[PDB]
Amino acid sequence: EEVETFAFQAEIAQLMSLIINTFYSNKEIFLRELISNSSDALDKIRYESLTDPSKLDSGKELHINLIPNKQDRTLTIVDTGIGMTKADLINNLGTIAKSGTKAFMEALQAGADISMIGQFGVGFYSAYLVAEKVTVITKHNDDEQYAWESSAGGSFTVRTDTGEPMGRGTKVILHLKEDQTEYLEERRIKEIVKKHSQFIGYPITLFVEKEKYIDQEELNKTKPIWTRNPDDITNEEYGEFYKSLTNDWEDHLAVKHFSVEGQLEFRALLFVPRRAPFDLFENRKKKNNIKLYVRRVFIMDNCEELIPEYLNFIRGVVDSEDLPLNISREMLQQSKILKVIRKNLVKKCLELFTELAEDKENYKKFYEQFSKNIKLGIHEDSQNRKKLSELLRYYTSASGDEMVSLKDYCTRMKENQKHIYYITGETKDQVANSAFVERLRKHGLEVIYMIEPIDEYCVQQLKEFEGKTLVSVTKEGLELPEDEEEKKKQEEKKTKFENLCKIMKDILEKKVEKVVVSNRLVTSPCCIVTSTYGWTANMERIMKAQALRDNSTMGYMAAKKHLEINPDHSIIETLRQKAEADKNDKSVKDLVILLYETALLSSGFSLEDPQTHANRIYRMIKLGLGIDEDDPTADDTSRMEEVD
Amino acid sequence: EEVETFAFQAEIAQLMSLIINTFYSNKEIFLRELISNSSDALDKIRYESLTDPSKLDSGKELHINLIPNKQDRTLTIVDTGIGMTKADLINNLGTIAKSGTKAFMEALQAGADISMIGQFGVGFYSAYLVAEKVTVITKHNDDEQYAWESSAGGSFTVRTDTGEPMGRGTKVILHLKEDQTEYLEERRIKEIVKKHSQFIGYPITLFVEKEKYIDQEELNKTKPIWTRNPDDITNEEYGEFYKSLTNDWEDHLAVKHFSVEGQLEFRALLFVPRRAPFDLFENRKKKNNIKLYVRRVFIMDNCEELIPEYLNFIRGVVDSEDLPLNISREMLQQSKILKVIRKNLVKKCLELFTELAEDKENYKKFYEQFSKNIKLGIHEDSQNRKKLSELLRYYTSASGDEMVSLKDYCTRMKENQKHIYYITGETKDQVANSAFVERLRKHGLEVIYMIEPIDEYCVQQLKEFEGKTLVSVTKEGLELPEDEEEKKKQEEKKTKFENLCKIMKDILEKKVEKVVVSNRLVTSPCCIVTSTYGWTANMERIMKAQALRDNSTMGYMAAKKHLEINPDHSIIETLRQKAEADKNDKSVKDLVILLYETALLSSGFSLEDPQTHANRIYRMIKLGLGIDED
Amino acid sequence: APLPMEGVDISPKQDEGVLKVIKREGTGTEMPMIGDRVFVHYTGWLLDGTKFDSSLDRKDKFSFDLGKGEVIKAWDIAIATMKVGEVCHITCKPEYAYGSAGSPPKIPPNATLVFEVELFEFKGEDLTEEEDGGIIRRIQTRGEGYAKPNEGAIVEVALEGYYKDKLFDQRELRFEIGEGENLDLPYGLERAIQRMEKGEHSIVYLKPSYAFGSVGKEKFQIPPNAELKYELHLKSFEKAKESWEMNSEEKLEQSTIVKERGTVYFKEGKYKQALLQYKKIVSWLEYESSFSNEEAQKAQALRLASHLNLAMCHLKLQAFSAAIESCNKALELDSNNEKGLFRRGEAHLAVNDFELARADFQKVLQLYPNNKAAKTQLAVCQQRIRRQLAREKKLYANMFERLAEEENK
Amino acid sequence: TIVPATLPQLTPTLVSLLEVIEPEVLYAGYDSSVPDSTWRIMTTLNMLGGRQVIAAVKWAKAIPGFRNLHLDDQMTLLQYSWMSLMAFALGWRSYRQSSANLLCFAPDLIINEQRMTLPCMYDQCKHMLYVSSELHRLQVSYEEYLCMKTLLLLSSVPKDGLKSQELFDEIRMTYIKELGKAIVKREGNSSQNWQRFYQLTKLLDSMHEVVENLLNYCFQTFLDKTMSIEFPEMLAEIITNQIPKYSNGNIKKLLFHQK
Ligand SMILES: Nc1ncnc2c1ncn2[C@@H]1O[C@H](COP(=O)(O)OP(=O)(O)OP(=O)(O)O)[C@@H](O)[C@H]1O
Ligand SMILES: Nc1ncnc2c1ncn2[C@@H]1O[C@H](COP(=O)(O)OP(=O)(O)OP(=O)(O)O)[C@@H](O)[C@H]1O
Ligand SMILES: C[C@@H]1C[C@H]2[C@@H]3CCC4=CC(=O)C=C[C@]4(C)[C@@]3(F)[C@@H](O)C[C@]2(C)[C@@]1(O)C(=O)CO
Ligand SMILES: [Mg+2]
Ligand SMILES: [Mg+2]
């Protein structure tokens, strides 16, 4: 058939408007773009002088000057880079999607040390976000000095300059809009510059008129150091960098500097601070303090995808030279990249901690600040759970005041220690003196003391260490490596007190699930234990105390209480004899309740109504003191025989 | 000096690359854009047919068809809109940033009821995010059918179409990239359409093959009822909209249909669920629930800037014409706009809650699920405490099982009250039977019972209600407007009881700050109270369970404990007499500790030993049973 | 590891696939009977050394009901042929396992399986309401069909048996279930006949709570609280109509008859029988039924009478706690019932709940100021308390002084 | 200056609690050499049913939340769903043991197509087999299964409501949430989870058809006397108590999802 063929066209007027109004969300970036263009201009001249030094005959200092002018509502940026010839000036600034730097890089041969920022061709025009008019003055070594002028009117002009020679380089003058004058203030400048530039290879000097004279203040004093081989960096150097980066008067605790090669190129510095921040779990700004740079230009911060939350205390920098960006250069074009970055950053953080742990003194300093984060990692990171667990330290019944690892536990333990025993509670003293661990102490078994509330969750998730499961000494069914003779004696004793098992349950029918004869008590007449499933003491108080929780769940998850009796206590034996003689003896009923309430307190449970515990005691005190009974106390017949 | 003047030009090859590779953040978008172009095509003809009905002689049903074809690895979109003339294929598709839609709108009479999506002139090319080649077939009423083709190589072609007649409309055929074929799946297409374009006015039908026959499913079955006048919408209609919107099965509890007509214009529907909402399935935790649409097209759904977190259980839609958008049309330009929207959404939510409060039964239903959020809003966002506090309800010592407002408490205050009394604790019952409220009950004063852990945070902001001061009944220095005769009696008795204060200050020196003679007590021999400035027992027990605890704050927030003595109690008088007779009587040393320990428990403090307490009891029991020492 | 089971022959006549294997010898005691719950070791190997995962891998003894077919046949037989302490590993022939089913994941179809069985102990069936072991059944040879007799059923059973070390001779019994005294037999045989299948042949053992009680007679040389065992053969029965198929009429009619019968039993001192009769009211009328208002009122009167008399029976039977529950039910129906309230107070005094006893006698007088007995009760309750208080005062008279001394030794 | 702390999410154990609660598969049967008379199969299954049904009661009593409902409500829920639960239990065992159209009732007895000699099985096995087929097709996990079984217990109420209604409603949301987790845990997905959910909610809602069609045959078998069928006394009782609730339309179906 007949086919007509056409080239694509573009409407310049609309295209110009889109660049100005729809590509960028934050006007402050105009400065970023102008600075980046200048740093490229400087790299290109540097590259050329590398093989032919005469290129710098026109001047050797490579630097960027920022010169605001209040009086004219203008801002001038001056570099000392190559500059542009008349032909380039027209072709590169007059063509909306052309890029001279891209062409330059294409011209360059492999092995060049040149890394340039840009390739899109539309960045310059961002000047019009704040400028009314833009003037560009430039001098190239091979041409006359020329002045370019425009506004986004759809045309532009070129004339020969008549002013002072620049020697070489490009000078960009913005004439600002009346309401954009905030960009002429020194404070605002410096804030923008610090945020978006910072690691530019050339110095930036800001020229400020003061009480007049010009105060020449240099920015970019801190150099990136991640670019250096780590072998070559001293600890002092890392420390100074760190302090500058975080405005932290204190040094780092630890640092990991590494690189990744292949597919995605990386360099990164990860620092561990010596103090956890007070707002570590409270600040509402995004938690990951990792800044992402591309070709040393800041791109993104506060990115959730880079690091799992449990590691939100690591401070650091990630820098790459090959990731795709969107048009505004404010975010990555493809999210799968972040998936990879995250995998590698986590892997190396764990290596750092593992190594850190070999130094016991330093590990203590570390653990004391960040043990909370490790524990959260146990709950959430299902892949590194088997590595994170080796970083845990606990006080135990053996260990005096030292905290020990789980590995340490498991080498001191005994041939019959098929299980790892632990107890949880509010504080070390209460736990240490608990009835629940006395039998274990008697036989020389070690018990791990878990104190922080968070531990209640970790034990769920942990289950076992090297094949040995964890068991709670506060639950029913605790297995001890008892002798067979001991087991037989314990069973013989169950043929006794049968009546108390029943009587006590009846007294306390509405309060407990079971009354049983036990063996974990070698002190105390009784204790309360929880059945194998459901919330235990501590788990319940913690949940009840949360600021924001649905209490409807407490109608499902609750302890089932069993009361354990020590048959070799004198109270119990006396009650057996007394109760068998008279099961309705009122004094038995009252003392059984008192023992029950006492057991709840000693076992870690609160009382339903503490007042009526207190009243029982007060009554006994009054009798004990001889308080006269005057205050403690006040002191047809066949109808009910009817058979119906 | 002669000055040369130049026009600006553009490099087409690079321009095309930027549009395809670095404008769009995702690939879902290509469908989003093609559908929007079709709805505009349909509106243009619909409009013209209003003055000249013959425009529809070529076909009257206005609709959009989606037809995937796995065998050819293609996807075809067919509209029944206005179509394009040969001249338009060249001018509108061959020119970047040209927009026919924009020109059309400019040419309209000012009162035309037209709202169209588009003005930038680049969305068409988003097709190349997933296509290798694009073919467009079109029929306009005034011209022949033509076929446009391009691989986006910097040229395109136009041929006379020699295939089947269309009658009228535009058919876009995408030849998909070999490696992006999930877009041919029924599942994927439905997901995308529902997310981005379910409120497009014309029906969209998806055609797929199954056991075979073609199953023709309409996807946009729900209408954007927010465009209707609110007075014409029944509750059943709102309820159905709500369920459809949220994939609920439960109805809505309340709805506010609101509009704004100022510098900004928008409409919104805000719904209150009958059950607190929850993340049934994986989503971003703490995602908010207000979705923002422009001209019935979805823009974004988790913009924190839109509404405070305490109101994140409101579900809803904001639909606003004329907001400036980003080239990707995924983000709003000029965020100051969101600030304004937020102000208005909050204002109206508060009015809605106020209205619910009129219906006592429904308010209870509300409050039972959402009282936490109200409380958070007291703590946070202080400018609204003045309204939020009136939505609070509490049990009090005078309400039985009803919860009442602070206004009811105020109504019932005695003329001698300048203070509102409250107590905090763990349960209803533990508070109700507390020694601390016994005297207040004696004098007929009402006490508010605060129960939830959150109440402790909240109470620190609500210092005043209608000019009255809020005070606690478990602290040092509690004022009760009693006659001075009682003060005189205490001064008369302190002369004999200070001797115990001194003895008891030596006992327990390391445990309490002081021992004083008091009057808040009636029947217990003693109690433990908190200092005027400091933290209460309830504060300590909750701080201890925060899990994500600091250390310096635990030392810092520890309570100071003061012991108060009831002089009139028989135990205390017996104690005075024995203690004076012999300061070092061992029986006194132990009686004092026992009373102390008991007082902590009844006062709400955890007993820290706790084993010693148990042991003291065990000895008492042994004597009670007649068990000797050996 | 797997055993060389291929070296073991088949148990005599066990064409049922049961292996003649002994690894451990037993205690020499007898075999379990049908229905006995035999507590056993259970582990093993499946075809060709496949590990068998079971309850004794964690030492959890399995409770097995012999002769009911709840396990594969070879296992059931091994229990029947094994003594306590004996250990067998049975190469169950496939037909006596899962056959061709191939019960996945671990049983190949037509697989020979090796099960390790040990008997630890056994008991007969508990035929009682509570696990007291009051009625124990050991099935001898028979029982078929799924029907069983119930209260009101007419039952034909042959009974022969023992008491102490002497025998009851054989007699044929044709009777209505629940008429224990007109059999002049233990209460337990009612409860036991009610669980028998047609043709059933079994031995039933009775402890004193089911064994002859106030039904016991010197003519059999049997005291109340007798030690008994009987051999029963159930031949037939006429099952009584059940409440789920009964009319509202029939429920009231039968409840009325029962009230009258219960009244008589109570008066005759047959309190257990009276109790058993009054309970019949309760299930007919508590069971959901649509009654007319007149019928409902009659039902309410009957329900109240049961609950009041049940409490009365419980008081006579010293079940004071039960008396509390039954009188409470009576009081739910009638909150001012003088008898229910008075009796609740008595039950409380009976177990020294003095304060509660007083609360009830005080209420009786508030409603019935002329209940002279409530005054008498109330006064006793008060004095009983006073006496105890005096004892406590003495008990703790020098409590603090003694503790002060103990604490310093 | 003191603000609330955030908390980690506590992991629910409702599925593992259910794993512990669940009863063993019960044995029942007759020697296979005995002819498969239609009535013999049925009587055997009725006896099996009786035992399984009572096991289901203690199973229910042991369930968190449910156990705190007024006893009358507990009995009501058990009656209305007893067939849903038994049908679901059969479908599971069947499909897990085999992809074939088998009804695996007990380790002792499996009915293949040629043994379905009862007109009811010829007509209704398509539904019994449907459930097995769907569980097979959908590759249903055990965690999802348990969550669903619990929800079936909670699938219907009297039209007049429950006494502890405001607890019932809690329990229902509680287990809906647990099922949602059972789904997330096997999928690892986002939007697919709602779709998986509806694939499964539709079962639970279609189960009402499965039950009513079977229910009518169950009632016909019990009430008429066409075969030598013995019933457990407990089934005779539930059947006559349940027939009028059903036939009078007093049972409200709670259908989770429509569309
Ligand atoms: N100060 C300067 N000195 C020398 N050449 C310059 C200067 N500023 C701009 N140019 C030239 O103008 C071209 C256009 O630059 P512009 O900043 O618009 O785009 P870019 O940097 O190529 O793109 P991007 O938006 O990706 O940064 C450059 O490629 C370069 O050749
Ligand atoms: N299906 C269609 N029927 C008729 N005209 C169409 C169709 N699709 C595109 N056009 C025409 O081609 C032009 C191309 O518009 P395009 O979608 O690229 O930009 P747009 O609508 O401004 O989208 P955006 O603002 O998102 O870039 C339209 O203005 C319209 O005149
Ligand atoms: C087809 C129906 C459905 C049947 C039931 C389906 C569910 C079920 C699963 C089992 O694992 C054991 C028994 C039962 C519980 C059942 F098999 C029997 O009760 C008989 C039954 C009601 C039925 O066979 C009759 O209508 C005959 O009464
Ligand atoms: Mg640039
Ligand atoms: Mg468009």
Residue numbers in the entry:
A (entry chain B): 15 to 225, 283 to 706, 724 to 732
B (entry chain A): 15 to 225, 283 to 701
C (entry chain D): 16 to 424
D (entry chain C): 519 to 777
Paper text:
Hsp90 is an essential molecular chaperone responsible for the folding and activation of hundreds of ‘client’ proteins, including the glucocorticoid receptor (GR). SHRs, including the glucocorticoid receptor (GR), are hormone-regulated transcription factors that depend on Hsp90 for function throughout their lifetimes. Although FKBP51 and FKBP52 are 70% similar in sequence, these co-chaperones have antagonistic functional effects on GR in vivo. FKBP51 inhibits GR ligand binding, nuclear translocation and transcriptional activity, while FKBP52 potentiates each of these fundamental GR activities.
A 3.01 Å cryo-EM reconstruction of the GR:Hsp90:FKBP52 complex was obtained, revealing a fully closed Hsp90 dimer (Hsp90A and Hsp90B) with a single GR and a single FKBP52, both occupying the same side of Hsp90 (for a discussion of Hsp90 nucleotide state, see Extended Data Fig. 3a and Methods). The folded GR is stabilized by Hsp90 at three major interfaces: (1) Hsp90Src-loop:GRhydrophobic-patch, (2) Hsp90CTD:GRHelix1 and (3) Hsp90lumen:GRpre-Helix1 (for labeled structural motifs). Unexpectedly, FKBP52 directly and extensively interacts with GR, with all three FKBP52 domains wrapping around GR, cradling the folded, ligand-bound receptor near the GR ligand-binding pocket. The tertiary structure within each FKBP52 domain closely matches isolated domains from FKBP52 crystal structures; however, the interdomain angles are significantly different, probably owing to the extensive interaction with GR. There are three major interfaces between FKBP52 and GR: (1) FKBP52FK1:GR, (2) FKBP52FK2:GR and (3) FKBP52FK2/TPR-linker:GRHelix12. However, in the GR:Hsp90:FKBP52 complex, GR is rotated by approximately 45° relative to the GR–maturation complex.
